[PDB]
Amino acid sequence: TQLQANGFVVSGPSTTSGQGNYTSPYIYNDVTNYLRDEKNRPNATFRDASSRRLAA
Amino acid sequence: QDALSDGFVRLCIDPSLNFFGEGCKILVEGQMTDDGSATPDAVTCVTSELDIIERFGQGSVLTESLRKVFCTCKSGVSVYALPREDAAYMGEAEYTARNAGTIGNHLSSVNPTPNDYATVVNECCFAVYVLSSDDTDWQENLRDWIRSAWDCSKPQCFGHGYVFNKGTLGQVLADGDNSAELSRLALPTTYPVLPYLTNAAYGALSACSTCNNPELNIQGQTFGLLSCINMPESCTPGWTFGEVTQLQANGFVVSGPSTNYTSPYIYNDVTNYLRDEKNRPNATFRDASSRRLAAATGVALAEFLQQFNGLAVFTKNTNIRTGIIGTNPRLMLGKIRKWAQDNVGTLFSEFDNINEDIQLLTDFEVQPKCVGQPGIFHLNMRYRPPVRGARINVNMAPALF
Amino acid sequence: ATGVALAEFLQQFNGLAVFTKNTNIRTGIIGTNPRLMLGKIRKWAQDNVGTLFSEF
Amino acid sequence: CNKQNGVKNILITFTDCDTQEVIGPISHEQPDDTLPTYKNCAWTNTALTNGYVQRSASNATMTLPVVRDLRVPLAFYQGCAQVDVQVEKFDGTVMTLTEGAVVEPEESDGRSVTMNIVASEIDELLPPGSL
Amino acid sequence: CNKQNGVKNILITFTDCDTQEVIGPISHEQPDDTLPTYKNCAWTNTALTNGYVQRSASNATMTLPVVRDLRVPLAFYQGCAQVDVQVEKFDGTVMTLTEGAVVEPEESDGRSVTMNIVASEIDELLPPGSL
Amino acid sequence: CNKQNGVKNILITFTDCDTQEVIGPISHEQPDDTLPTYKNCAWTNTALTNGYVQRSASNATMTLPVVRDLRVPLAFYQGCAQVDVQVEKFDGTVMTLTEGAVVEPEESDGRSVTMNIVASEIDELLPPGSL
Amino acid sequence: CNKQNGVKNILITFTDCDTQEVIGPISHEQPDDTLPTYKNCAWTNTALTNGYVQRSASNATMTLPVVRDLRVPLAFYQGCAQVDVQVEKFDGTVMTLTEGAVVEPEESDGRSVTMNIVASEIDELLPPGSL
Amino acid sequence: CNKQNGVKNILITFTDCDTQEVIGPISHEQPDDTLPTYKNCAWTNTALTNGYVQRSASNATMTLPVVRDLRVPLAFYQGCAQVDVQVEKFDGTVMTLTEGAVVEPEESDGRSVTMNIVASEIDELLPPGSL
């Protein structure tokens, strides 16, 4: 959750369970490392990576 | 677990899990035991039946009233409690008193007299006030405050209070005034169940079933049965038919047995209002349904009339110029009449004669010269509540073939 | 027995909305008027022929 | 005016077959100008030779096109519940039907439902003045 | 005075069924001398045989030709909004309509629009002295 | 305005049975003014003599005329795929159907199709205020 | 003068479907007194019984009587091309229509052509001061 | 425009079943406004009790009305020769059918014929952008 808060892309295992065979990785929070406006804190206009491609 | 690994789903399985809902406001007032962990003389919102014993003590009359209130309603109300501190076949079918005073003499002295509604509950408008005491002073104080809630001087908080008067024919027939704000349940001298349980059940059922559609009379085996309350079967009537006729002619909510345990049952859902001003049997405010109809009609008309606040009004002058967003008294009266017609069947009867029952007058024509002030309007309306079923009067005449 | 049974049947109207000579019924209301009450009582009497009454 | 053909009140009472839940009597409204059509004779006849006719048992049916009520599930109008229909015409005629059953539900679009109701018998009121 | 056929005020309130936004009531102006027309009776009869009539439920229509306002979108006059009309005549008669809908939009040039408004009922004020 | 008959949203989800690939839920558009038609009650009655009714198990059907999506093969609309259709009306009622199958596919021209969707049950949402 | 009814500019752009060639936008001229006529609401209402309305999807139409250009083939005015019509009134209002198709062409003498254009929607500019 | 319903090309190839002579492909034209009509799903479904469906083998059919070519005998259009029909719509869809057979010939007037072609499977080109 700490990594989620400060604009970091967190990845995890597809099936944790227990031992067995290999598992594919699994990503979260498709966001960019943008946390601050020019001065202020809450600039969500460029948080998600989708907003970047949408603007372009 | 591999589906809950991500932060998408946040499962919070737990038994209590209070649900969303504002419902209908009911205030229950009763004494509290020292075991509880709540601030005395302060209205509070109760969320579930699980924690009522913790906050209001074990075996306290307020706790039992809360149990009955939650029993008789699954969803549709939000219950507020007013804890009070004590002054310085047993019980119900489910079952030295734990609360000092006369509240322990009704098992099959010195009672607190707060008189602080004006401060504890200042401007919170409650629908039904439930009182769990038989003291005449406490009930009179509650009646006085509820009457003060209906003042033309200040904005109103319409409500209704529920009490009980246990005793014999003489006792109950003497604790009765012209208080249209109180419905005095009249329990017999040898009534098995603890009176405040039945009082709370009655009040909770009334508010809970009506205030959503505030015209359903609490009568009959389908609308006026206290299902949660149970009492053992008996062959001794609570009152004689002469006594029942006297009470029903004297504005008391007479209950009856639905003859194992038999759930109690009500006959007439009326208020303690017989005489009008000075005198006259004004039937208008007899039924408790008329009270909720008056409150709802006043509130709805107040909300509807709010659209005229700030609008330009062209009295006298001439017709509305094109492009303006103004109005004139005739069009306002027409809109009021159409709104009144639209509510027929839910708040009124059809009408007697709508051309006379509704009239809108400007302040200029109601006051003498130089007294009338622009903007102010006078609206007068007399409505008739819907007609509901009553006596059938079967006249059966046998005959041979 | 017939009086008791008629008492059973007639309780449908206790607290029910009643529209008198005034006018008819509007859509959605759960009320009734004396004509339909008479019809319902007549049908109830008709259904009990042979167990509580003669033919008529 | 006893010269007007049409319906004035339509009361329907739904009773659940399983939970015995009673809903009604709820007034209803017509979707169009098609009036309910009736059959008060419980016997269906058949043509035979030389004026003879065969009497066979049948039902008192009723076709009732109404607009559904948004407070009542659509399944209640298509044979999942009992119906007690009571229709009042403009001239005073009253047809009372109890313990009816919708036999042939038809595809409805969620507003107007045509109910084919079958019952043991139908009672007629015959505004005052009979025979 | 008194004997004067014509409209004095026309107030229209627009409500968008999507966003619940209220615009009005804005006074309006006639485009020509054609007056608005009304139909108050909610039942439409039909000529049957020999004095019989077929009363079926219908609407309380209203034809209202008015001049468009430049501050209100044209779609608001062509069925894309809910209109609450209120017209007062020169003799004191007031027609009140609420929650009406424009049923048949006709192509307009952008200044004069005619609206066929359908509502459940229309209230008449009947200047003092009635029945 | 609450008094409006129509369809607001139509969502269809295709699930190919051979490869277990799920497509959707895509939104769809009506081809004409014919609304989708439902039949919720899962039991079909049959008329018997003198009020009796023979109750037997049957399906919950639905007729859905829509415009095909140009990104979806036409065969998905004619019974080669499992449909998950959900329709919302203007009055708030929602029809939800899952694990449906197209029974009798008529030939289509490639723009407008009509599905006869069959399912065990159909869910009614009944906008607030019920029974 | 603000109070002035008429059309100030009319721009039409032709895009042939087969060759994807664009021509315009070219200013056009009215042939006679009649003004262009609009219909902005994309939903067509329909009168039902007792105030109800059946809302169904439709188009946004436009009638454009103009004088054809001598440099543009007459077939482009009669449905053999895609038109991008833009018209401005004298009071500042602008109707914008994009990707329009001429539906019902009638025979023209070769100088004056009346268009019947159907498009998904038409945008209103509504000169300053709105709602 | 990308919003157009209609056919663009129709090619039919005739193969003689006796002498193995191949003719075509030859372009054809519609006789009326009726478009060719398709059924792609090779399996047919039958409604059963409580949501179940019986899958059985079927055919991929097509109805194709065309104007016959004056260079091709009429018997070739009525089931005495193979057909390899191929139709392309305006929006990019292309339906391919090979080794088809005409099942139920009808009396043609000598200009317009309506084919009912039954083949094992029909291929869809499904213009770019899929699933």
DSSP structure string for D3-23: TEESEEEEEEEEEETTT--EE
Pairing state between β E7-15 and E22-27: antiparallel
User: What SS3 state is found at B231?
Assistant: strand
Residue of A nearest to B6 (CA): A28
- The CA-atom distances, in angstroms, between B57 and each of B31, B64, B200, F72, G127 are 10, 10, 18, 66, 70
List CB contacts of A41: < 8 A, sequence separation 6 or more: A35
The stretches of D6-131 forming alpha helices (DSSP H) are none
CA distance B61 to B29: 9
Query: What stretch of H or E contains B247?
Result: helix B241-248
Residue with tokens 């491609």: A53
Length of chain F, in residues: 131
Best CA proximity match to B258, nearest among B222, B288, B303, B284: B222
Q: Are B78 and B128 in contact (CB under 8 A)?
A: no
CB contacts, 8 Å: D4 with chain E: 45, 52-53, 55
* Number of C-beta neighbours around residue B33 at 10 A: 19
User: What SS3 state is found at B102?
Assistant: helix
Q: Are H77 and H59 in contact (CB under 8 A)?
A: no
H100: DSSP letter: B
**What's the longest Cα–Cα distance across chain E?**
55
Best CA proximity match to E103, nearest among B399, G52, B149: G52
Breaks (C-N over 2.5 A) in chain C follow: none
CA distance G11 to G25: 6
CB contacts, 8 Å: E99 with chain F: 1, 3
Residue B227's φ and ψ, nearest 5 degrees, are: -65, -40
Pairing state between β G82-83 and D43-47: unpaired
Residues of F contacting chain D (CB within 8 angstroms): 5, 35-51, 53, 61, 63, 89, 91-93, 95, 124, 126-127, 129-131
Residue with tokens 């009396």: H107
The stretches of H73-128 forming alpha helices (DSSP H) are none
* Number of C-beta neighbours around residue D93 at 10 A: 17
Query: What stretch of H or E contains B293?
Result: helix B288-305
- How many angstroms is the resolution? 3.2
CA distance D131 to F119: 54
* Number of C-beta neighbours around residue B18 at 10 A: 9
CA distance B341 to E40: 14
Q: What angle do CA B105, B110, B112 make, to 5 degrees?
A: 110
**What's the longest Cα–Cα distance across chain C?**
39
Q: Are E14 and E23 in contact (CB under 8 A)?
A: yes
Q: Are D62 and D42 in contact (CB under 8 A)?
A: no
CA distance G61 to G36: 11
CA distance E72 to E75: 8
Query: What stretch of H or E contains C8?
Result: helix C2-10
CA distance G37 to G65: 9
CB contacts, 8 Å: A28 with chain B: 6-7
Q: How many distinct helices (H) and strands (E) make up chain H? A: 0, 11
CB contact under 8 Å between H129 and F70, yes or no, is yes
Q: Which tokens hold the place of H119?
A: 């083949």
* Number of C-beta neighbours around residue C28 at 10 A: 15
Q: Are B262 and B230 in contact (CB under 8 A)?
A: yes
Residue E40's φ and ψ, nearest 5 degrees, are: -85, -35
User: What SS3 state is found at B140?
Assistant: helix
Query: Which of H5, H30, H49, H50 is the best mutation test for F, with the most CBs of F within 10 A?
Result: H50
CA distance F56 to H117: 40
Q: Are F122 and F84 in contact (CB under 8 A)?
A: no
Q: Which of E53, E54, E57 sits opposite D29 (nearest CB)?
A: E57
G36: DSSP letter: P
How far C52 CA sits from the closest chain D CA (Å)? 19
CA distance E28 to B320: 9
Pairing state between β F101-102 and F112-119: antiparallel
* Number of C-beta neighbours around residue H30 at 10 A: 16
A28 exposed, middle or buried (CB, 10 Å; 0-12, 13-18, 19+)? middle
**How is chain H split among helix, strand and coil, in percent rounded to 5?**
5, 45, 50
E19: DSSP letter: T
Q: Report CA torsion sign: B3, B9, B10, B14.
A: negative
List CB contacts of B263: < 8 A, sequence separation 6 or more: B225, B226, B227, B229, B230, B231
Q: Which tokens hold the place of H81?
A: 């020769």
Other chains touching B, judged by 3 or more CB pairs under 8 Å: A, C, E
User: What SS3 state is found at G21?
Assistant: coil
Residue B293's φ and ψ, nearest 5 degrees, are: -60, -45
CB contacts, 8 Å: B347 with chain C: none
* Number of C-beta neighbours around residue B124 at 10 A: 11
Q: Which tokens hold the place of G83?
A: 């038109």
* Number of C-beta neighbours around residue E41 at 10 A: 10
CB contact under 8 Å between G43 and E80, yes or no, is yes
Q: Are C38 and B392 in contact (CB under 8 A)?
A: no
Residue of C nearest to D87 (CA): C36
CB contacts, 8 Å: F51 with chain D: 59-60, 99, 118-121
Residue of C nearest to D67 (CA): C27
Q: Which tokens hold the place of D118?
A: 């079958």
Q: Are E28 and B322 in contact (CB under 8 A)?
A: yes
Instruction: Establish whether chain F is in contact with chain E, requiring a minimum of 3 CB pairs below 8 angstroms.
Output: yes
Best CA proximity match to B257, nearest among B239, B276, B275: B239
Question: Which of B:2-21 have CB within 8 Å of A?
Answer: 2, 5-7
State the distance between the two ends of chain B, measured CA to CA, in whole angstroms: 80
HSE (side-chain half, CA atoms, 13 Å) at F46: 5
Residue with tokens 């708040």: B347
CB contact under 8 Å between E48 and D5, yes or no, is yes
H36: DSSP letter: P
Residue G54's φ and ψ, nearest 5 degrees, are: -95, 100
B359 exposed, middle or buried (CB, 10 Å; 0-12, 13-18, 19+)? middle
Q: Are D115 and D65 in contact (CB under 8 A)?
A: yes
CB contact under 8 Å between H3 and G101, yes or no, is yes
* Number of C-beta neighbours around residue G98 at 10 A: 15
Instruction: Give me the DSSP letters along H38-80.
Output: E---SEEEEE-STT-EEEEE--EEEEEEEEPPTTS-GGGGTTS
Count contacts between F and H (CB, < 8 Å): 91
Q: Are G33 and G117 in contact (CB under 8 A)?
A: no
CB contact under 8 Å between G82 and H3, yes or no, is no
The stretches of B24-135 forming alpha helices (DSSP H) are 52-56, 61-71, 117-120
CB contacts, 8 Å: B335 with chain E: 86, 96
* Number of C-beta neighbours around residue E79 at 10 A: 26
CA distance H108 to H68: 10
* Number of C-beta neighbours around residue F131 at 10 A: 10
Residues of D contacting chain E (CB within 8 angstroms): 3-6, 29-30, 32-33, 90
CB contacts, 8 Å: G17 with chain H: 1, 4
Residue E85's φ and ψ, nearest 5 degrees, are: -95, 155
